[PDB]
Amino acid sequence: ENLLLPDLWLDFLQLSPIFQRKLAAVIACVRRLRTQATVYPEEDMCMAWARFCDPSDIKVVILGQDPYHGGQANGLAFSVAYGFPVPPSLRNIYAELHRSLPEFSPPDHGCLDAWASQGVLLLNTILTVQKGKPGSHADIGWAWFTDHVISLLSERLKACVFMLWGAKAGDKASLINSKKHLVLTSQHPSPLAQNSTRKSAQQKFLGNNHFVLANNFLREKGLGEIDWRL
């Protein structure tokens, strides 16, 4: 029985037999579902977000929702596989980076591997989706697992940045230790939010200074900063 996670992640999560049975159950649930339809991403890619660095070296946690549902998902949040157009939210993420970092120039691709290897965790809360059906796998058991990853990251890391974009990602702030960690919030990078009124609950994404504020926190905490260039 494969829990799909790298040994470092298994060693980090200290999963109890109970939690191991939980993870295996969802994994199994998804295997069931695949015999019935196309499911993204591939099973050997659904946990790709965990294969880029030692979990204890995570410095920035960025939450997505579920994977892209048109074949573009690569097992990381926001990133797309080679050859696909850079999606609207990512284009907007590149804009905030370009607005705030003099040395960043938006790339022509959506591969975020260079961030991931530095300890930026690109984590969708839901790790699978049925082709053409956003939200289809929202209630199959992924949320307990990613809530658990979020909680353990908070618990085990001395200091880490969590970027929570939009009200839905914002709900996860309850899992995070705001004393130890920097919890950064704003509206989602989706083009829609751009035309929201002046007095919004959350600040605009374009202007949130999240990527600079992350490096400021890391620096003050005596940790390596992120080179955001792609």
Partner: protein, 83 residues
């Protein structure tokens, strides 16, 4: 009715949905001027011929009931159409 079909139905352009972002009623209402009855999926596609973002707002899965259509300018301006 496929989500792709709705966009072409409404706009005549053949765009693939690139992302579907879930939003809560309050953050949607800040943009649309109308409050949805529940969560909203923001299905968005870029039209490179016009440099505009085309957004189909739908109810959450599995219904995907069409709610509004927004087209965003190269200049940031929103054209809103309740569905």
């Amino acid at each position: 009715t496929n989500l792709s079909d709705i966009i072409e139905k409404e706009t005549g352009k053949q765009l693939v949905i690139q992302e579907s972002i879930l939003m809560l009623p309050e953050e949607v209402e800040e943009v649309i001027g109308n409050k949805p009855e529940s969560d909203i999926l923001v299905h968005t596609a870029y039209d490179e011929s016009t440099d505009e973002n085309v957004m189909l707002l739908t109810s959450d899965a599995p219904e995907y009931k069409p709610w509004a259509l927004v087209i965003q300018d190269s200049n940031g301006e929103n054209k809103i159409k309740m569905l």
